Design a binder for this molecule. Structure first.
Ligand code: POV
Ligand code: POV
Ligand code: WEV
Ligand code: WEV
Ligand code: WEV
Ligand code: WEV
Ligand code: WJP
Ligand code: OLA
Ligand code: NAG
Ligand code: NAG
Ligand code: NAG
Ligand code: NAG
Ligand code: NAG
Lengths: 384, 65, 46, 52, 61, 73, 150, 150, 150, 151, 151, 151
């Protein structure tokens, strides 16, 4: 009820479309009395009306994540901030009026004193939206946060598989189905989310232009080749702790395989499939959470092209801009942002926040053979 | 029937969205500096004069529908 | 003293033929492969 | 046009352009770059190069 | 830095550039690109020109 | 610092959240709704204020946007 | 830095990551979009549950648009010939391996929605094959990431 | 400034932005125009509503017009070799991704109006798949504006 | 001025603007004109009503003629290489986009006149599709005038 | 010591073709056998979860290519020698084109193996034994890419 | 003594082409003769495990190329002579394209052989006799690849 | 005396083509004339072993190419003259393209022969007498490759 509109809001996050998604939904719940009076309509109002409370929670959550990164119709807002200040750049760096020619795109410096102070109380500061290196900051942020949300939602899914054993009273299943599963995930991937948190607090802009990469040191955990002067280590004793964290995960594969079937030919071969669909599946499930970064980037890029190409030609006109020009520009813009940026992007983010629950969350605890109740009642016969 | 029904919800959005565009251009906001070909503030209000006369023009489409 | 030549390396006929006969050997292998998956004919009435 | 080549060295390995007349040769030379022109030099600079 | 350039008339004649002129007698390698295209004072003894035969003589002492 | 402020303002819901809940049949769902809203929304803010804390880059600005916000900030 | 023609192989990695990936997203939309038009005459209720192979194939274009943005933002004047060949192999391995994932979605999603009309039990099985056919486009992404950071 | 032949790659991106996007806009109009004739002998009332899949293909042509006008206004004698390689990849990635987007429109727009004749309920489902095959030309637009204006 | 081989690429823009718009206008009048003969056996009344796909395919031919006269009047002995690259891309932009538009007119104009043999309600709908296949040659015209008149 | 400036071109083409040609084989094994699921499941719905073994055994083929496309991409240095980059080229073709064959064989015998199990359930233990022989073609090509690239 | 910089291209091609073209022949033998097992299964399901002989014959074709892709990749050095790497180019082609031919012959005879065994059980002693002749075509390419790789 | 460094390319390309092009001709005559065994096996199953001659005579085609490709691989030597190495390319094309075409005619006559012998058994001495004339063609390429390779 919470995490499915929340995973919809990380990949469809916009304050402007967060207003339109719930105002379409508040209209469908405050006027729902007269809609149940009608018999039936088309399935663009039958399937949509059957989920009128799902879309309401997708609106109020995407107002929030459409405020963390600012992005309101690709426009951004100021609420007591913009901590990046350009005026100390002209003073202490001896950086005069040369701006005109020479270099027309000039980059600030965080290590010189006065430019950056405070990481903008609530969310992403709006200096990035008027910058042109905006994407090389967000792709370092939106990708690494797609794994942070991809591990603690999948570690939460394996914590719900403990109560699937201690309630049914199967304590044999704990010592090969929950304990080696949580060691295999915390040593490899739970160390990755504290390696992302380490690089955010350790390295600053002054020291370490030679900063390490988290792509290389994660691969160099599996491939045991340690020692190279290209990538410096993140901290002291990294060769000590990371060789320990990989060998505790290597013994989890015999811990899941060799110690369950001692109760035989079909519990060794067919239940090895239960290990190898978790062994190479858990890596391919973590990387499958990169689709809430790709959809967050493709939605943020589509919001620019309807502003800087459709709205901007209706705005950047000298004398008669808001007159007869902008009346037909916005009426074609309102059709283009509903049919494209709200219908298909609202449906592409709908499925890939749904398939992340069916495959990457309901495979750790949810088996689901099932048989529905369907009680005998006369609620089929309401009015027709 | 539906072309008369789709026009009011577009006009009701057309008055809400374009009024706030008028106030965000009246305050001379720093995020909107791409649409400008003390002197620069007067160009900003001019676009706010532009937006408002189209925000009021959607009220006429509401009464026609 | 000006107008010096462009300095092509001495192994230019080697690197030209290594790139040319691979990138049309990996293009014909790519074209033939994508031709067979495009025209798959699974059989579809049911 | 002028000539230009990258290795006009001696000591024949496969295709070195300077070959000696007798093979036990005491002299050996090596040009890591080379550009010579005769018979149509104009304005004290090289023409287009007929490369090797 | 500049190429060797022989001239007989007011017009220039044969001209020759290299980046590393180096020779060896026996097995002693001696590099000569520092005495040729930078020193600007070469012993071009007979540098012939005839529009069908041209010679370039470099002498190093 | 808002990090020591917002850790308890999003920590009110989720700790004092299950303390004040009506005794109706929706107790096991609304407490799950209140706690998971506090976990997801606060950690979303937590991994965004830590990305800008101790940074490595600077905003590459256009040339008209070099001298403009000196009058605005 | 590098030569003047060094930036050609990097913009051939920004273009071929979008050309060859929107061609795979077009085949998964076209071949399965005729699967919706032939199914719906018989079973006209599944035109919202069964557009999920079209929506799944709309991510292959997004996987290529992401790599075409990391490449076109790392483009500056005077990149080396080494660093530009990495962005060419990051544009072919996400474009031509999205052309593969656009084939396997367009063939499975075509026949999978004919077999879902005649029997609704296949919907759990059809969506499972589209998991294995979409990760070919994701495996090309995580090898385009490991090349473009260098 | 750059070499003499440097303007060749920028104009080739100005032509291929219009050549390959009109070749996709024509196949979206020609293949979905034969579907109007096969629909017409059964349902004459659905004529004006079935001009939508050739309207959507008409926007594929103006996706290539606003990139070919954009390149042919920023042209100058003596542009650098780096700046013109950026506009070759800006025209190849908006033409050949509009050729793919116009291919998928002409296939789901042809078969979509065949099934609209036998059943009118498909028309809201056909117009959904025409949107997903339209944004493949719009994804090529937003990677053309990145490469050309930078 | 420019090099001696510079006028080659401008002449191949004057001729490619003609021979690719005449191949589009060939396929426009021949593929649609073979549908007028099959319509004529049952409906001999609308023969003059059916020259409209043949008329609008001849408009594509005069789109390529206007640019080819405009390029061939902008030729001098010793133009720059930049100017003659502009008119090569101005010939492909109206040639190969008129070849697409003339292919689309010949396909829908063939099925349109065979559909109006059995139902004359398609006639107001047949012409409305052909304007969308007409403007693909017009979009190629207004990028050829922009590229050549720089 | 340092190789020439063009030398890393062949090692990158071994990194891309180890993933391009192995995904083009795993797409044939998924499409050709997955259409066999769509024809079998109309008459036998109980075997739609045991018949997805030819689509998980073609998914190992793309994993066989992904492992060495990472392993090549970690041995990439600025100015690698020309000998060391032909090893990455020879490792990429010997696992892409080997997994292209292994994915084409799995698609054919996985298609017929599920068309035949709908009429004879005793075939299913024989279909796995041919799908094991058609899968180790991607494994034989993997352990040549592991030998070539690690030199 | 030392070879040129480009000299190692032809030996790492013969390492790949011994594995690429022998897995392309072993996949044709597995696919074309695995289509025939599903045709004989619908009428004669006792001969399933006995008809895996035409796909275990194609599995030996795949390990003929695996051996000499190990014999070549373990004979690689930096700066091998151009003669020593041309030997391992024809040692890769004469076993890849021999196993490619011997895999086309295994898959065709293995297709018609196991479909004729379903209607005539006396053909099984004859089909397994033809598959010996079609398997030594990959063996004649192996003993000419070993006589080239070693020198 | 020492030739160019690329001189031994053309001799190994003759040792490869003597085995590759003979294995392609021996695999056509085995697969085509082994398909014809399974067509005559269903009605006339007593003529199976008597009609394995067109896959035996197509197997002698492969040992014609094995003899030449061993003699070329043994006459190989570091620093061969350019005259001696082209003598063994022409020895590889003389027995390569011979066994390719002579192995084609054993396939077509052998497939047409074992189907016309199972109905008219008088054609068995007439089938084997045409296959003899198509097998000496593989020996004309052999004994002109023994002249060229040992020249
Ligand atoms: C048809 C197939 C066409 C293939 C044709 C190929 C033509 C052959 C090219 C070789 C050129 C000469 C080789 C050479 O040495 O030059 C360079 C090697 O640099 C390279 O190796 C570049 C090769 C990359 C080609 C990839 C293209 C495929 C893109 C397709 C993607 C499309 C997707 C679009 C959607 C080095 O330069 P140099 O001058 O030798 O160095 C000396 C200068 N110096 C001294 C200053 C250092
Ligand atoms: C689909 C097409 C997809 C595109 C696929 C293209 C595949 C072709 C790949 C060829 C790559 C070779 C480039 C290379 O190796 O570098 C060479 C040069 O570098 C260049 O000069 C770059 C030239 C690229 C031309 C390609 C444009 C064709 C697109 C037209 C399409 C328009 C269609 C409109 C209708 C280095 O060689 P060199 O000898 O060292 O040169 C140095 C000498 N110099 C300094 C004087 C330069
Ligand atoms: C698990 O083993 C398998 C191994 C694999 C992948 C590779 C190598 C071993 C192989 O590549 C090598 C090269 C050849 C060889 C020697 C294989 C043995 C294979 C197994 O064994 C035959 C059969 C097995 C199915 C087969 O054993 C049947 C069970 C059978 O027992 C049925 C008999 O009626 C049949 C006539 C007899 C014949 C075929 C050997 O074997 O599969 C297998 O996956
Ligand atoms: C077992 O594989 C046999 C040989 C193999 C493995 C290996 C290579 C040397 C071979 O690859 C090459 C091809 C050897 C070659 C070029 C001929 C060898 C022929 C054998 O010698 C006839 C026949 C033949 C004896 C036999 O297969 C049949 C029983 C039969 O003898 C039965 C007869 O009634 C029929 C008349 C007769 C024909 C030959 C006269 O065929 O087979 C084999 O032993
Ligand atoms: C032919 O003249 C028309 C357009 C021409 C010539 C356009 C090009 C020259 C190019 O300049 C333009 C830019 C191509 C383009 C960007 C057209 C956009 C929209 C129009 O607006 C829907 C329809 C539209 C007014 C109308 O023709 C359709 C009949 C209709 O819209 C009306 C209804 O029948 C129907 C219900 C509706 C559907 C799908 C809801 O389709 O273009 C025309 O008319
Ligand atoms: C001289 O050659 C004719 C035209 C040519 C060669 C034009 C070229 C210069 C070309 O560059 C273009 C196509 C100029 C042009 C665009 C002409 C348009 C129609 C012609 O008219 C002017 C028709 C038209 C008179 C006539 O042919 C038809 C019978 C009809 O008059 C009858 C109507 O029922 C029909 C609907 C109507 C439509 C088709 C326009 O035209 O003819 C001609 O002779
Ligand atoms: O921000 P920056 O862009 O500056 O870079 P960064 O480095 O600081 O951080 C961003 C990196 C991110 C934090 C890393 C996330 C990105 C990924 C691509 C990781 C997800 C992939 C996974 C988990 C699978 C990885 C693949 C393998 C292990 C291959 C399998 C091999 C074997 C089993 C042997
Ligand atoms: C440098 C390497 C370039 C040359 C490599 C060429 C190798 C070709 C390998 C495989 C191509 C075959 C793909 C076609 C599949 C056939 C489909 C079928 O017949 O069913
Ligand atoms: C531009 C040119 O080629 N000039 C040459 C000089 C040369 O000295 C003369 C006789 O060899 O012939 C001329 O043509
Ligand atoms: C300055 C100088 O050393 N010039 C010498 C000259 O003395 C010598 O006689 C001549 C060859 O005989 O070569 C030159
Ligand atoms: C070369 O030309 C200059 C300028 O005319 C002249 O002074 C000089 O003497 C010439 N060189 C010789 C060797 O005559
Ligand atoms: C090449 O030139 C450099 C300096 O120009 C010199 O140090 C070096 O010794 C030369 N090479 C040889 C082989 O002498
Ligand atoms: C030029 O000089 C050479 C050598 O002295 C001589 O052989 C030739 O005849 C001369 N040519 C002319 C035209 O003087």
């Amino acid at each position: 009820i919470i995490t499915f509109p929340f995973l919809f809001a990380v990949m469809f996050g916009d304050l402007g479309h967060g207003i339109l998604m719930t105002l379409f939904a508040v209209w469908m719940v405050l006027r729902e009395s007269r809609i149940l009076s009608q018999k039936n309509e088309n399935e663009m109002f039958s399937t949509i009306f059957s989920g009128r409370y799902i879309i309401l929670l997708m609106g109020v959550f995407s107002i929030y994540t459409g405020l963390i990164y600012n992005d309101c119709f690709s426009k951004s807002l100021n609420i007591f901030g913009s901590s990046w200040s350009v005026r100390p750049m002209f003073d202490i760096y001896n950086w005069t009026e040369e701006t005109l020619r020479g270099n027309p795109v000039l980059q600030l410096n965080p290590a010189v004193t006065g430019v950056f102070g405070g990481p903008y109380p609530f969310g992403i500061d709006p200096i990035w939206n008027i910058a042109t290196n905006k994407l090389t900051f967000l792709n370092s942020f939106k990708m690494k946060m797609s794994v942070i949300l991809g591990i603690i939602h999948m570690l939460f899914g394996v914590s719900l598989s403990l109560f699937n054993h201690t309630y049914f009273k199967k304590p044999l299943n704990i010592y090969f189905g929950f304990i080696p599963e949580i060691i295999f995930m915390t040593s490899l991937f739970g160390y990755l989310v504290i390696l992302i948190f380490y690089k955010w607090t350790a390295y600053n802009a002054k020291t370490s232009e030679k900063a390490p990469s988290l792509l290389i040191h994660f691969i160099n955990m599996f491939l045991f080749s340690y020692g190279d002067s290209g990538n410096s280590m993140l901290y002291s004793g990294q060769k000590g702790i990371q060789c320990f964290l990989v060998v505790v995960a290597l013994l989890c594969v015999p811990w899941m395989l060799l110690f369950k079937p001692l109760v035989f030919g079909d519990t060794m071969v067919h239940q090895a499939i239960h290990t190898i669909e978790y062994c190479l599946g858990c890596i391919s499930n973590t990387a499958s959470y990169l689709r809430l970064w790709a959809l967050s980037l493709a939605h943020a890029q589509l919001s620019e092209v309807l502003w800087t190409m459709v709205i901007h030609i209706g705005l950047k006109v000298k004398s008669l801009a808001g007159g007869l020009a902008l009346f037909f520009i916005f009426a074609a813009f309102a059709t283009l942002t509903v049919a494209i940026l709200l219908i298909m992007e609202g449906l592409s983010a709908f499925l890939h926040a749904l398939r992340l629950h069916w495959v990457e969350f309901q495979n750790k605890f949810y088996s689901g053979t099932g048989f529905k109740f369907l009680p005998f009642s006369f609620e089929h016969i309401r009015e027709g | 029937p539906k072309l008369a029904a789709c026009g009011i919800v577009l006009s009701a959005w057309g008055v809400i969205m374009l009024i706030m565009l008028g106030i965000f251009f009246n305050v001379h906001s720093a995020v909107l500096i791409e649409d400008v070909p003390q002197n620069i503030y007067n160009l900003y209000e001019q676009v706010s004069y532009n937006c408002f006369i189209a925000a009021s023009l959607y009220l006429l489409l509401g009464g026609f529908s | 003293t000006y107008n010096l030549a462009y300095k092509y390396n001495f192994e230019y006929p080697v690197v030209f033929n290594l790139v040319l006969w691979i990138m049309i050997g990996l293009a014909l292998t790519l074209i033939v492969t994508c031709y067979n998956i495009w025209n798959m004919d699974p059989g579809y009435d049911s | 046009y002028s000539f230009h080549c990258e290795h006009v060295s001696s000591e024949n390995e496969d295709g070195n352009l300077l070959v000696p007349d007798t093979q036990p040769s005491l002299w050996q030379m090596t040009f890591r770059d080379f550009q010579i022109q005769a018979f149509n030099v104009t304005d004290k600079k090289f023409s287009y190069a007929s490369d090797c | 830095n500049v190429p060797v350039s022989y001239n007989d008339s007011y017009d220039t004649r044969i001209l020759f550039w290299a980046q590393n002129f180096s020779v060896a007698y026996g097995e002693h390698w001696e590099d000569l690109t520092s005495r040729t295209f930078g020193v600007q004072d070469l012993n071009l003894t007979g540098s012939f020109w005839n529009d069908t035969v041209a010679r370039l003589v470099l002498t190093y002492d | 610092l808002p990090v020591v402020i917002f850790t308890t303002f999003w920590g009110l819901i989720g700790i004092a959240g299950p303390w004040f809940v009506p005794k109706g049949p929706n107790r096991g769902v609304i407490i799950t709704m209140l706690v998971a809203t506090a976990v997801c929304c606060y950690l979303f803010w937590l991994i965004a204020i830590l990305a800008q804390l101790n940074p490595l880059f600077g905003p590459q600005l256009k040339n008209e946007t070099i001298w403009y916000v000196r009058f605005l900030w | 830095n590098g030569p003047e023609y060094a930036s050609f192989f990097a913009v051939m990695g920004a273009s071929a990551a979008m050309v060859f990936s929107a061609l795979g997203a077009a085949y998964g939309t076209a071949k399965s979009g005729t699967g919706i038009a032939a199914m719906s005459v018989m079973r006209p209720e599944m035109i919202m549950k069964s557009i999920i192979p079209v929506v799944m194939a709309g991510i292959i274009a997004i996987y290529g648009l992401v790599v075409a943005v990391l490449i076109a933002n790392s483009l500056n004047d005077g990149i080396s010939l080494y660093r530009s060949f990495l962005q060419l192999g990051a544009g072919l391995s996400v474009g031509l391996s999205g052309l593969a994932a656009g084939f396997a979605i367009g063939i499975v999603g075509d026949a999978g929605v004919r077999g879902t009309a005649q029997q609704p039990r296949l919907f759990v099985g059809m969506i499972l094959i589209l998991i294995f056919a979409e990760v070919l486009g994701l495996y090309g992404l995580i090898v385009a990431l490991i090349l473009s950071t260098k």
